[model samples]
Target: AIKLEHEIKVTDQALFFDGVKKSVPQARTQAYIEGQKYNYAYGNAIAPHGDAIKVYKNYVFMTWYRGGILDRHVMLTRYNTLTGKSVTIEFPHQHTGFEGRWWVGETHNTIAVAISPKDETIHLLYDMHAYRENTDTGGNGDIRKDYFRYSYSLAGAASVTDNNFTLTQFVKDTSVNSEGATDYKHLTMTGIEDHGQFSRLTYPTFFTSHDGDLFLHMRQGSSHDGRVVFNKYLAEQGKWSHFKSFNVLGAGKKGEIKNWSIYGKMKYADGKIRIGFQRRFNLPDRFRAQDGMFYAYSDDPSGETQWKNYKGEAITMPLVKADEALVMRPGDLLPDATAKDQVSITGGFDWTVTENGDLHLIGQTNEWVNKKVIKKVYSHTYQKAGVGELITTTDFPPASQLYTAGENIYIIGLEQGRPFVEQAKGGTNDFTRVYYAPVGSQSFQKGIVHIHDGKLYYYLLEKGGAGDKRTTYLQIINLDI
Candidate 1:
């Protein structure tokens, strides 16, 4: 593994933490806050919405919204590893600040960036969250009216010298005829140029395999009724392939589709494309919605074929229900996994695979007990021998994330707004505290981490009081283990 140097510095300033609080309906129903007003009382400024960061070669890329409520713009920053310098680029789009159905700046919407490995072209997707015009979305926007947004740059844009990169490097519009053609409207996918097929989208995520092939997936429906759609980059052709369904929430005869949604992530690890998520059923009662955990993988790198369960049993695509072979009920470990409408699971869910071929997944679950809500963090591990086990501890705090470096695995998270990390050796599930930010170090509100080689690149917003402008900072830590 490569050794790294630890360094921390401020990157940019962000919008106010409280000036743009979004009040949604769920806050009232789930947390019992009147008029969904409780949603306004929660959140930090910088990462209050989407926490996405990535590292490629000597540069680091991160996203945020800036200028507060007055001049809010969708912003992106590129930092250089060697020069220790950064440049913030503002896109043409504006944040749809503070409108119910939460407008454009809704906390659920995310800003994502990806680099085409073979071609080095940069791809960006942002400012969208299932905004299809209908009775559900307050009937405000329409799918056929330029709802889906995407942007890309010419080849070699990601690695050019800082002096050579600017807003001009990005194409003015979508590539319709060729990678050079820029006359196409920036509304729909080129190959799959149908708005109806991909209008309502959320969680736009990008995944890269060991071989450097890039893939992306996004949820295509609302929270209670959604499915994952996948696409791969054709570097030689300068376009994305037609979208394919990875998992369908409701797939059966006579419109008997199941009313369930998945909350999790997909990663390429241990020589496979694997996913771990919890199933949330569409019940009249919101608390009992969360039910089971699931694990699945595809032996094929394409991730479009050869899907299977944890036991290696082949499963069909457009996955219907939680397949018995692929599901791990909460009943397996929790004393009250079946809380019967009193248990709800939510938090930062993440997973990673180590060099030794072990899969590590982390998530949090909340249950109503003793007249209060009890939250617990859990780590589920699968060893090389096909043995699986669930681990829970009072040590790790809520929203902890998992990552792998070389042959080691680690859990990194905030403990009372301070950063701390725990590590585990390959082939074993025993994790011990490895590093913790010192007392009086700059504290943060929320953040996202990316582990490259052996260094942890942390993008965070410095702690701010209500109505304070958030400052974005980057902290790099060396994994000396």
Candidate 2:
């Protein structure tokens, strides 16, 4: 009864920061077991804990982590969406733990922002989750060290002007730490020599290509032994190419030598770079047993050399098995039977590509039925350019996500906290809830989503709140689709 029709235009809800401070310690819902030693006891999710955003022209860059454990800084806000104006810049860095978790903080660090369209620099990667120092004893010895925290700026510092954006246009490696503390520990922004492979790393994502270049995907190991790395920023030699290993876990597999865990999405639509994922089971107790759904693409364009699959064939990389030549089993397209240990691929998956190239994918699976747990949300379409034929749907919204403009194909989510939007028709699977931002008591939490030109900026986060502070907003809809 809510397949909405249209009528949308949100526009002003701005106010990027205001209670940027928090705290919680009363056992705040414990449990991080499994050889522990990670804790900020996670309160108000590390005070905004950064939910990246970057919109180049007319500014709109964002990233946060400001105070929760006696001032844990690392902030940057620059919104000039045509002079509604904003400007914040801090980054002398802060947020690294160990001291019996009182020095708490590190819910996977988080702070990613990127913008380098032919040297318009303003790239930062912060997420020191993968710690080091006495070296990962594999299970909590906890003496945190920057698992490669990089920072950048100065090239036009993201098209400057909002009163000239400053903090000295970022880029400082004052270099000191090892406890000597001088903080500015930039591991490498590539003068090209990263022999240690940028130390352990973690999800620091940043992608842009189809000409604007700029790239930096991450994940080095753990979460069941990882690999899927990439780097490449040569904006006319401003340097950055060294780490490259697209997928690898046991390349050339055999008995007891197996491990898998890659949960999807690496986009750069239509013209290529597309990657879709879902593979789990490095089982130590059935590693959340996720299953099937794999896709690939490259078509060069600096996605680093050809690659393929989804029928265009040619696959080969560090990928060692998610095999069956690129799997895709959405519970084998229902009818029952289900197994793969009864489903489980959770993380609201996503994928996009329109403007004529087609291909759209959205995910969510759960399935346990009989023991009761069923939850499904799948939408996969591949038309003409993506090789055509293959359209699926299981309605959407499990905190939805998946986008593309100019040929449509959005999906946006949150049904109870309000804001819902659906639309299909860029390659099929007919959706339609064209826009709905209704709310009464105000409650929303999906933060981070940017789609320019045709609108839809949405950046929520404002629900309940009683301790570790919280409140972040920015909604700019326009559903004229």
Model 1 residue 423 CA deviation in Å: 0.3
**Model 2: per-residue Cα lDDT at residue 169:** 76
lDDT by residue (45-161, candidate 2, tens digit) is: 543344477777767677776644444567778777675767777666665542223244545567888888788988888756554444442343344444577878778778767
lDDT for model 2, please. Answer: 0.63
Query: Which regions of candidate 1 deviate over 4 angstroms?
Result: 1-10, 20-22, 25-51, 97-105, 133-144, 174-185, 252-257, 284-287, 324-327, 332-339, 369-381, 384-399, 465-468
Top candidate, metric TM-score: 1
What overall lDDT goes with each candidate model? 0.65, 0.63
Question: Candidate 2 — which pairs collide?
Answer: 40-105, 247-318
Return model 1's CA RMSD, one decimal: 4.9
Q: Estimated TM-score per prediction?
A: 0.85, 0.30
Candidate 1 lDDT over 1-481, as tens digits, reads 3222555554444765453343454422232223322123235343534536778888888777774544556677788988988777777665543222332235555678888779998888776767553424344333344466677888989888887777777877644423334322255555566766767787778888878888888888767777778888889888888777777755533133456777777877776777877777666543555656777888888998888877778876767766633445553445554545556665546666676667666556566565456755464544543445533343444445688887788878777788888777755667777777878777787777877767898877777544434676788888874
